[PDB]
């Protein structure tokens, strides 16, 4: 009983779920669910068709191969979803008193097990969380009981007749109706067109002729590529790319050039003539954010027109850098296909719901510091009661000793005050009390009463204590900021003195 | 019951503990503990070195004088009541005290001493002293505390040493380790400053000084030159040798430190040691002066520490005319204040602390951040046949950086990688893995779809281990004590390698 979350268990009629299917098995699987020729051996499905589709790619070519499809499988009649709180077979069988020999999924398909936990249903399906960061479940079915499932087709990616994995990824992008929902046929065509025509452009032909066109050093291949990147960017095909990449130093020509040098150095002949091997090699390079226009938590390049421009620019740069630092046409063929595949992976990551830095236990990384709420409950300021709470914040830095100057805390007249007594900061166990003064009616600032430094080997725990004088709940009208502000070292941003700001974002909730 | 930790509670005869004491009370307090709301009480600790932390001039807490540490003993029998939570309201409920009477009034009554003292003549509350500390704090009811006898452990002021040196030399005893003589370091510093400013090339280089306000780039350029020259004098000879390779100790950082010092020290500030300390304590870059980098205190001999501080004193003096607001500071309060910050950081590094990638301390490297999700995750338990799971958090600070794979320990029998349950999830997208042994002690798992992390994209790497033998695992059987998560591919000494993100585990039995 300590192992079953009944809150997530239920019986249902015509229980449905989804199963990703690999190329070839799409039509065969509609015949019926059959085990092919250990405690957890069973048929696996999920409640999220979009997460199912990720199980659907050619296993001989998982990175770049073709995507099969998704089938929906339904049990006729009544089905008991038994949600389990732990994924250790031994543990389960004990706290349920099962045959510590019989495999767990062996036992789950027996009349006896179906009797005990079935609640009147014809069979049991186990439910576990799909993954960390996911709200989906994975369903584990017994292979005998699975003989009863009807199999309808949800989608077959092969039928859609699109290039690469475009079908699978445009499917997954439906999950978000924000949302990067790009037409990759449009982007592929625009890309081809822009490459072809940029090649025929006068200043580009001109700038190519100036190329050492032979093996050289990274330092000068990089210099040339930076020059090629500047002139290329001046042509009308790349006018919008020029405008969106002029400010953010992540998108500068020097990073395009470093990318291009790095691709050209690692792509041999064996590699270039295979999409799977190409993708694997490219997938371990740093700096891809430069080409994607992804930085600071945002996909900036989010229109078909600007993505194809960026990919076209990058395709030419690889072409130029290959004779300078390489070893061989790939720049227009396998390179473009592989990099489109990588765009799709990363766009999909950003489409999926996720906590930003400084939310829940996701670290906030800035100026060499790393700061985070110690547990999920710490990031929650409970409301609607008279009294006290504590909130732990972890704090360190990557290398040398960097200071912590203090922390800015939210206050709300009557409902949220800084317990100045219990608020402190502890550095490798050394407990440091704080002097807290109010700035205005909504912000208190606490400073350590002896110096705080963190670094490699030196971490701090910032303990914030809140007091509530009323039991009236906080309403949104009442609170401006949603972050606690830990202040690092003092710097001069904009001819003016400021502290590095390490932000930890809280949620106001009731019990 | 649910609120009291029997295991850390006990009755003791002549229970003693320690109390830090401010200047002007080291003698007063020995006459007796008198009071001069829930937690209103007298505070002591089982750790006399932590107690020494509370001994500093409350009006000058950064830099003021340290008072002393006294030992306080109850005669007869005393109950130490250790509590699992620190919320007064929770306590009173789960123990059935009155929700009106404050906790530290309740605990000093015969009704509480009857019910909770196990026969002792009074109760003391024990709570954990701080995160990252093994000490406890004791909360003594004030009236009961009248029975305490008070003996002197140490009076820092009678040592008659400069600054806070007596306090910090006492604290350094905890590790029998950085145990420097600051009297010696002060004297060597005075001496080296005095003889350096009379050296020929130093006087020569001081003539070349603009000796007027100039640009920050200009003064930086000048100070780097002064640094090179000074470092060639024989007073700094060993310093020259130790700061030659590591770029954190380069002259450009000394230069940057001195520039930033001069820019924040105005006249009010230079004339007050507490204000100078306040201002210096929030500057970046001090680790260059302290010789502190990569988790280690490099300058750990009195001669080298004096050399670095002497050098910095001179540079501060040269830098003030070029970006300043005032020059006796560089040898008066600057050296006093910086000696103090030295002592703080040294003390941090003397205290036991988990290093990056140990337990839940993050490993920060090449823009990534990785950590064991929980303390238990970092533990590979042994002594049974079966399975365990281990979660590792992964992200990066800005652009998408890849995760190539992970290297995992194996042992022919006592430990194999469970390739079914081992996986990696990226903002919820579950990614199966291809694992291939690399010898008999190291398996390498690759993601079957590309993995990138970055601002707003994180991964959970789930490692599943299988044990075939109940036989425990022995120290010899296991080569590495770390799990290797591989970042992007880079070149180091003409060879390709992945960024290495290390998570250090401990092997243990269970109970």
Numbering used by the authors:
A (entry chain B): 3 to 39, 48 to 187, 200 to 350, 354 to 536
B (entry chain A): 3 to 38, 48 to 187, 201 to 350, 353 to 537
Q: What are the paper's exact sentences on this?
A:
Protonation of key histidine residues has been long implicated in the acid-mediated cellular action of the diphtheria toxin translocation (T-) domain, responsible for the delivery of the catalytic domain into the cell. The function of the T-domain is to translocate the catalytic domain across the lipid bilayer in response to the acidification of the endosome. Remarkably, such a complex task is performed by this small 180-residue protein without the help of any additional translocation machinery. Formation of the membrane-competent W+-state occurs in solution upon acidification of the environment to pH below 6 and is accompanied by structural destabilization and partial unfolding of the T-domain.
In order to further analyze the putative pH-dependent structuring of the TH2-TH3 region, we crystallized a full-length form of diphtheria toxin (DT) harboring the H223Q/H257Q mutations. Notably, two crystal forms were obtained from crystallization solutions at pH 5.5 and 4.5. The first crystal form (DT-DM-A) was isomorphous with the aforementioned WT structures, whereas the other form (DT-DM-B) belonged to another crystal form. Not surprisingly, the mutant structures also form domain-swapped dimers and are similar to the WT structures. Interestingly, the Q223/Q257 sidechain conformations are distinctly different from the H223/H257 residues in the WT structures. Moreover, the acid-induced destabilization of the T-domain’s short helix TH2, previously reported for the WT, is no longer observed with the DM. The latter is overall consistent with the spectroscopic evidence presented above in Figure 2 for the lack of efficient conversion of the membrane-competent state in the mutant. The replacement of H223 and H257 with non-titratable Q residues suppresses the ability of the T-domain to form a membrane-competent state and disrupt the bilayer yet has little effect on the protonation of the other four histidines.
